[PDB]
Amino acid sequence: NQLKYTKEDLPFLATVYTTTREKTDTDAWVKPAFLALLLPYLLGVKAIATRSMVPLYRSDQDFRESIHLDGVAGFWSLLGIPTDLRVEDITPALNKLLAIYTLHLAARSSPPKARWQDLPKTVQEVMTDVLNVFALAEQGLRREKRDRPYESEV
RNA sequence: AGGCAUUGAAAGCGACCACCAGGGGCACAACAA
């Protein structure tokens, strides 16, 4: 949103926190889960995402994983992505998470209202059988009232 | 009015067609205490 925060304390324990205005859990977890994979990929830092005000304190081999996610909504467990990740796994995780977000927002979403309350069903069909990726594409087409995909979407 | 004589060979189907389009999710609810 050349330093501008020079009066603020140096962050030895750097915590960042989310707020959302629909009241459900999957809606609460979609931005933290994305941020908790993302910030280690941008900055090489180690993340714990939790509801807990007390953290796990990190040290020289507590550091043996890059990310922990304490108790994510069940869309996470349904994707089968680990709740704890070593640094090599973070780009596989960001790929699966954005691939399911960019597939949920195509069908079972509306342009001003993302309807993340339905994300567990979009994950469960994609994981059951991979051709359901095209079943979701086709749902998108019908919402969009379009009979055929663009050449790019194919 | 009589005897006689109530039938006979062959054929018993042949061609073509055994479907056509279009739809194959639609809505919402993902926690409550």
Resolution in A: 3.1
Residues whose beta carbon sits under 7 Å from strand B: A 23-27, 73-74, 107, 117-121, 135, 138-139, 142-143, 147
**C-alpha torsion angle, residues A15, A66, A61, A45 (rounded to 10):** -50
User: Nearest nt to A139, CA vs C1'?
Assistant: B25
User: Nearest nt to A121, CA vs C1'?
Assistant: B30
Class of residue A19 by CB neighbours under 10 A (exposed 0-12, middle 13-18, buried 19+): exposed
DSSP three-state, residue A24: coil
* Distance of C1' in B8 from CA in A59, Å: 120
**C-alpha torsion angle, residues A114, A90, A25, A79 (rounded to 10):** 80
Chain breaks in chain A (C to N over 2.5 A) after: 1
User: Rounded CA gap, A58 and A47, in Å?
Assistant: 10
Chain B: nucleotides under 7 Å from a protein CB? 23-32
Q: How was this structure determined?
A: cryo-EM
* Distance of C1' in B21 from CA in A138, Å: 21
User: Rounded CA gap, A147 and A145, in Å?
Assistant: 7
* Distance of C1' in B3 from CA in A11, Å: 145
* Distance of C1' in B3 from CA in A88, Å: 125
- Phi, psi (deg, nearest 5) at residue A24: -85, 170
Give which of A141, A115, A113, A137 is closest to A125, Cα–Cα.
Answer: A137
How many of the other CB atoms lie within 10 Å of CB of A35?
15
User: Rounded CA gap, A106 and A19, in Å?
Assistant: 24
User: Nearest nt to A119, CA vs C1'?
Assistant: B30
User: Nearest nt to A138, CA vs C1'?
Assistant: B25
